[PDB]
Amino acid sequence: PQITLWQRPLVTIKIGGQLKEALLDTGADDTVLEEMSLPGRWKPKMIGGIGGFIKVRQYDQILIEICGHKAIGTVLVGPTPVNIIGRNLLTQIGCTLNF
């Protein structure tokens, strides 16, 4: 797919059998999802955004399907404005910026 940026690059992701909307974000190093229950243990992580830092819970080896493309990696869960798909998962699905 080729996605133009006249609108927000929102896609549907499936995680835990649920469909959610997520923002393809090249300016995000990590993938940060809104509050939800993920399996296993979690480790602590502090991430800095535009307004400062927030504490998130990191889960490893989580399966997440982005537009029919399966990816397995680190997902952070916390008080985020929207579900964000960062570079860690963007590289797994073969996403690039072109101009």
Ligand X SMILES: C[C@H]1CC[C@@H](O)[C@H]1NC(=O)[C@H](Cc1ccccc1)C[C@H](O)CN1CCN(C(=O)CCc2cccnc2)C[C@H]1C(=O)NC(C)(C)C
Which chain residues interact with ligand X by CB under 6 A?
A: 25, 27-30, 32, 47-50, 81-82, 84, 86
Q: Which of residues 24-53 bind its own copies (CB under 8 A)?
A: 24-29, 32, 47-53
List phi, psi (to 5°) of 21.
-100, 140
Count of residues binding its own copies (CB under 8 A)?
40
Q: Return the structure tokens found at 75.
A: 């997902």
Toward ligand X, which CB reaches closer, 21 or 61? 21
Which residue matches tokens 């296993």? 40
User: Annotated active-site positions, please?
Assistant: 25
| Residues 15, 20, 23, 28, CA torsion sign | negative
Q: How many CB atoms are closer than 10 A to CB 23?
A: 17
The contact set with its own copies (CB under 8 A) reads 1-6, 8-9, 23-29, 32, 47-54, 67, 69, 80-82, 84, 87, 90-91, 93-99
